Amino acid sequence: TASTGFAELLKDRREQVKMDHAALASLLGETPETVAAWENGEGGELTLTQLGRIAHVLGTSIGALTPPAGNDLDDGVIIQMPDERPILKGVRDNVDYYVYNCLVRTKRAPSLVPLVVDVLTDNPDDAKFNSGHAGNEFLFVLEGEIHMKWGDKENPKEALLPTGASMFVEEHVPHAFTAAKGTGSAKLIAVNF
Amino acid sequence: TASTGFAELLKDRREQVKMDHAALASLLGETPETVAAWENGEGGELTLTQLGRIAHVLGTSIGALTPPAGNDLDDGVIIQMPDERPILKGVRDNVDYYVYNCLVRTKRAPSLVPLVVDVLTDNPDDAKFNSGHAGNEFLFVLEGEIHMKWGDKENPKEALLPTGASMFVEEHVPHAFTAAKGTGSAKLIAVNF
Amino acid sequence: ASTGFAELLKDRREQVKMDHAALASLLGETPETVAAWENGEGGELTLTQLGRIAHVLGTSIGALTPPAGNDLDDGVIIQMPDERPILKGVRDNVDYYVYNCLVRTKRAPSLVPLVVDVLTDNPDDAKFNSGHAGNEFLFVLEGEIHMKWGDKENPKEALLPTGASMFVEEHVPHAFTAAKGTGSAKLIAVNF
Amino acid sequence: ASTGFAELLKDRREQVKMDHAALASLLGETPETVAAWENGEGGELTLTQLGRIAHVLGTSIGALTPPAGNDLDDGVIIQMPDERPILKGVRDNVDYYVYNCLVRTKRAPSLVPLVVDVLTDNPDDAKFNSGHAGNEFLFVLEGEIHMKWGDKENPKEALLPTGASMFVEEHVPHAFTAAKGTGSAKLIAVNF
Ligand SMILES: C[C@H](O)CP(=O)(O)O
Ligand SMILES: C[C@H](O)CP(=O)(O)O
Numbered sequence: 001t002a003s004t005g006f007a008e009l010l011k012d013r014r015e016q017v018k019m020d021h022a023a024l025a026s027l028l029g030e031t032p033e034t035v036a037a038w039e040n041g042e043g044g045e046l047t048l049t050q051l052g053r054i055a056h057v058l059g060t061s062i063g064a065l066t067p068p069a070g071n072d073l074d075d076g077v078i079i080q081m082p083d084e085r086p087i088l089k090g091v092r093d094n095v096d097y098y099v100y101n102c103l104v105r106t107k108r109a110p111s112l113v114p115l116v117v118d119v120l121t122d123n124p125d126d127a128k129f130n131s132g133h134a135g136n137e138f139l140f141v142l143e144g145e146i147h148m149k150w151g152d153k154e155n156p157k158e159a160l161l162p163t164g165a166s167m168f169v170e171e172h173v174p175h176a177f178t179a180a181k182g183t184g185s186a187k188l189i190a191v192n193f
Numbered sequence: 194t195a196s197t198g199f200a201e202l203l204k205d206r207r208e209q210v211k212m213d214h215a216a217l218a219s220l221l222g223e224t225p226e227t228v229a230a231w232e233n234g235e236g237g238e239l240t241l242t243q244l245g246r247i248a249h250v251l252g253t254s255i256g257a258l259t260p261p262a263g264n265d266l267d268d269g270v271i272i273q274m275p276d277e278r279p280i281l282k283g284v285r286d287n288v289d290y291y292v293y294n295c296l297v298r299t300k301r302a303p304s305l306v307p308l309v310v311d312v313l314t315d316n317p318d319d320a321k322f323n324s325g326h327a328g329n330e331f332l333f334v335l336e337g338e339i340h341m342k343w344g345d346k347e348n349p350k351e352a353l354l355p356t357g358a359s360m361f362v363e364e365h366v367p368h369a370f371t372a373a374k375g376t377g378s379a380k381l382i383a384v385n386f
Numbered sequence: 387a388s389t390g391f392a393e394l395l396k397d398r399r400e401q402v403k404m405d406h407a408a409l410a411s412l413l414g415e416t417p418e419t420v421a422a423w424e425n426g427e428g429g430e431l432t433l434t435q436l437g438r439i440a441h442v443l444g445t446s447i448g449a450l451t452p453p454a455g456n457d458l459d460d461g462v463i464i465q466m467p468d469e470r471p472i473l474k475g476v477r478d479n480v481d482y483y484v485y486n487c488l489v490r491t492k493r494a495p496s497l498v499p500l501v502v503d504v505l506t507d508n509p510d511d512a513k514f515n516s517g518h519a520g521n522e523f524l525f526v527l528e529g530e531i532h533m534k535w536g537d538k539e540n541p542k543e544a545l546l547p548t549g550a551s552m553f554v555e556e557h558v559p560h561a562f563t564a565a566k567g568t569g570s571a572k573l574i575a576v577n578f
Numbered sequence: 579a580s581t582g583f584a585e586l587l588k589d590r591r592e593q594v595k596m597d598h599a600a601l602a603s604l605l606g607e608t609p610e611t612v613a614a615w616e617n618g619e620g621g622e623l624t625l626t627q628l629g630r631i632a633h634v635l636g637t638s639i640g641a642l643t644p645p646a647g648n649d650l651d652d653g654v655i656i657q658m659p660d661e662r663p664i665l666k667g668v669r670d671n672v673d674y675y676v677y678n679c680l681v682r683t684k685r686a687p688s689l690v691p692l693v694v695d696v697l698t699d700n701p702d703d704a705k706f707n708s709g710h711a712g713n714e715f716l717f718v719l720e721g722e723i724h725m726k727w728g729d730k731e732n733p734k735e736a737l738l739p740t741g742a743s744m745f746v747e748e749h750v751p752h753a754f755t756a757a758k759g760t761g762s763a764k765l766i767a768v769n770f
C-alpha cells in the first residue's frame with residue numbers, strides 16, 4: 001500500500017522528469033536494479049531520510065511520492081457509537097481544563113476533527129488561552145452556559161453564550177472557554193475542518 | 194466593493210495578458226475611455242452577460258475578475274444566539290420531513306453550512322431520500338434515536354443511531370433520515386463543509 | 387453565463403437551505419423574480435446586484451458564475467506564428483519590450499506564453515517591473531540576455547547566453563536587456 | 579526531513595487530540611519513542627512504518643513530511659545551455675526524441691520544461707504516448723512539425739511551421755514527427 005503507492009508514484013515521477021533507471025540511480029549512487037526494485041514495490045524498508053534523498057534528486061517532496069490517506073468508508077459513510085469515543089483529558093497550566101471526547105473521523109477528510117468538549121472550569125478570571133491553531137473551528141453549545149474569550153490574551157474580547165449558541169473562530173485566532181461564572185461546567189461540540 | 198474589486202482585477206488581468214485599453218476595447222467593441230472607466234471603478238452597472246463577454250475576451254472566467262466573498266468576522270469570530278436562527282421547513286413528496294434551523298455561517302468559509310435538523314417523520318418504511326449533494330457532511334445525534342438510510346434508494350444500507358452517535362457521509366452519497374420506528378421524532382446537528 | 391448562473395444559483399440556494407421566498411425576502415425581491423433567475427433570466431443583473439446576491443448567500447460572485455469554458459479541439463488548441471497579438475511595451479518613456487502573444491486557453495487562464503523581444507541593450511538603464519503574480523519560465527531564444535532581479539537598487543544579476551533557461555518565482559521583480567551594446571535579444575516567457 | 583516530520587507529527591498529534599501515550603498505544607510503541615520522533619529522531623523510520631503512523635493519525639504520509647524545499651537564489655534559479663541533462667527516448671525500438679532538460683525547481687515540482695528534438699520524419703510511423711498528467715505548452719523551435727493527437731487509430735492532425743505554439747490538455751495522448759522527409763525538427767515543451 002504505502003510500498004505499492006510509492007512504487008507507482010516513483011515511476012510516474014521518474015518518467016515526468018525524463019530520467020531512466022540509470023540516470024536516477026547514477027544520481028542517487030544506487031544501481032539500476034535497485035531503483036527498479038523500488039518501482040517493483042520493494043521500497044517498504046526505505047528510511048525517512050532516504051525517501052528525503054530520493055524526493056530531492058527528483059526535485060519534489062516525499063508527499064508527492066507517497067499515496068493519499070486511503071479509504072475507510074462503508075459505501076460512503078462511517079459511523080461512531082457514543083461509547084467508542086477516544087478520550088483525552090486536557091491539562092492547561094496544571095489545571096484540568098477540558099476533556100476531549102473525540103467523535104467520528106475519516107481518512108477521506110483528514111482535517112475534520114469533530115469533538116464534544118467538556119468545559120471543566122467555571123472561573124472566567126482564570127481562562128487559559130491557547131495560542132491559536134491551524135484550521136477553522138465551528139462550535140455549538142450543547143449544554144450549560146459558556147464564557148468565551150478570544151483575541152489578545154492580555155486584552156481579549158468576550159461573549160456569554162447560552163445553550164444552542166453557534167460560533168465560528170477563524171484559524172490562528174487564540175481562544176479560551178470556561179463555564180459561565182460559578183455554574184460549574186458546560187459542554188460543547190467543536191468541529192475543526 | 195464588487196465594483197471596486199472588479200476594477201482592480203480587471204486591470205490585473207488586462208496587464209497579465211498583455212493588452213492595453215485599446216486592444217481590449219477594440220476586441221470588445223468599446224472605447225478606450227470606456228474600458229478605462231471600468232478600471233476606474235465605474236463598472237457597477239455592467240450586466241451579467243456583458244461581464245461574460247469581458248471574461249471571454251480576456252480568456253478567463255467572471256470569478257477571476259470578481260473579488261472574494263469578503264470579511265464578516267469580529268477579530269476572527271462570529272456568533273449566533275439560539276433565537277436568531279433562520280428556519281426552513283423542508284417538504285419531501287408533500288410530506289413535512291425535516292425542519293432546518295440554520296446555525297452560524299461566514300463568508301470566510303462559504304462551504305460551512307451548520308444546521309440543527311428536526312427529523313419529523315418516524316416511519317423507516319417511508320424514508321424519503323435525497324439524490325445526494327456536493328460537499329461532505331458531519332452529523333451528530335442531538336436527541337432521540339435516528340434511523341439512517343444511505344446508498345441506493347431501492348436497496349440501501351441502514352443504521353440505528355442512539356443519542357450521541359456521530360456520522361460522516363461523503364459527498365454525492367444519497368441519504369435519508371427518520372426517527373427510530375414509532376418514537377415520533379429526533380434531532381441532529383448537521384455540518385456541511 | 388446566464389444559464390451557468392441559473393444552475394449555480396439554485397445549487398447554492400438549496401445548499402444554505404433557502405427556498406425562493408426566503409431568498410427573495412432577504413433581497414427585497416419577489417419569489418417569482420428569483421425563480422426566473424433560476425430559469426436563466428438573470429442576464430441583465432448588474433455587477434453590483436450580483437455582488438449583493440452573493441453576499442446574502444454568504445459566498446462570492448465567482449462561486450455563482452460558471453468556469454471560463456472550453457475552447458479546445460479535443461484537448462488541443464493551436465496558433466500559427468502569423469496570427470498572434472502584439473503589444474509594444476514602454477517603460478518610463480522607452481520601447482522596452484515588444485510582446486508577441488502565443489497560444490492561450492480558457493482551460494488554463496493562468497497560462498500566458500510569449501516571445502518577448504528585449505529591445506534595449508544598456509544594463510545601466512535596465513527598467514524593472516515590480517514583480518507580478520504567478521511564476522515564470524524563461525528561455526533565451528536569441529542573442530545574449532543580461533538579467534537583473536530583486537531590489538532595483540541592490541539587484542542580483544547574471545549574463546545569459548542563447549539557450550539558457552531560468553525560473554522567476556512570483557512577485558520577485560525583474561528586468562532584462564540585451565548584453566551591453568549588442569542591440570537586442572529575444573526570449574520565450576511562460577507565465578503559469 | 580527528520581526535522582520536518584518531527585514538527586508536522588507534533589502538530590497533527592495535537593490536532594486530533596492525542597497525547598504521547600495515546601499515540602504510542604495505538605502504534606504498539608512507547609511514549610518515549612514518540613517523544614524522540616517529535617524530537618527529530620525519526621530519520622530511520624521506514625516507508626511502511628510511516629504509512630502506519632499516518633493511518634493511525636487519520637492522514638497521509640505526505641501531510642506529515644515537509645514540502646519539497648527551496649533551491650532559489652532570491653526567487654530565481656538559472657541553467658546554462660551546457661549544464662543540462664539529456665535522455666534519449668526510444669519508442670517501440672526507435673530513437674524518437676532526445677530530451678534536453680531545462681531548468682527545474684523544488685518550488686514548482688510540476689514545472690518540467692524541455693527542448694525536445696523530434697528525430698523521426700515519417701508521420702505514418704508516428705509513435706503515440708498514452709497521455710500524461712499535467713498540461714503542456716509547446717513551441718516549434720526549428721523546422722516544421724507534424725502533430726498528431728487523440729485516438730492513435732483515429733487521430734486529429736496538424737502541420738505546424740517554425741514559431742507555431744500549441745496547448746495539449748492533460749491525459750490527451752499525442753505524437754510528433756518532423757514534416758514528412760524533412761529529417762528532424764525541434765520544440766520547446768513546458769509541462770506545468
Ligand atoms: C475548545 C477549544 O476550541 C478546544 P482547543 O482548540 O482550545 O484545543
Ligand atoms: C439531514 C440531512 O443531511 C439534510 P439533507 O442533506 O438531506 O438536506
Ligand SMILES: C[C@H](O)CP(=O)(O)O
Pocket residue numbers: 502515518522560562575
Ligand atoms: C520579460 C518579462 O518577463 C516580461 P514582464 O513580466 O516584465 O512583463
Ligand SMILES: C[C@H](O)CP(=O)(O)O
Pocket residue numbers: 694707710714752754767
Ligand atoms: C513531446 C512530447 O510532448 C514529449 P512526451 O510527453 O511524449 O514525453
Ligand SMILES: [Fe+2]
Pocket residue numbers: 133137175
Ligand atoms: Fe480550538
Ligand SMILES: [Fe+2]
Pocket residue numbers: 326330368
Ligand atoms: Fe445531507
Ligand SMILES: [Fe+2]
Pocket residue numbers: 518522
Ligand atoms: Fe515577468
Ligand SMILES: [Fe+2]
Pocket residue numbers: 710714
Ligand atoms: Fe507530452
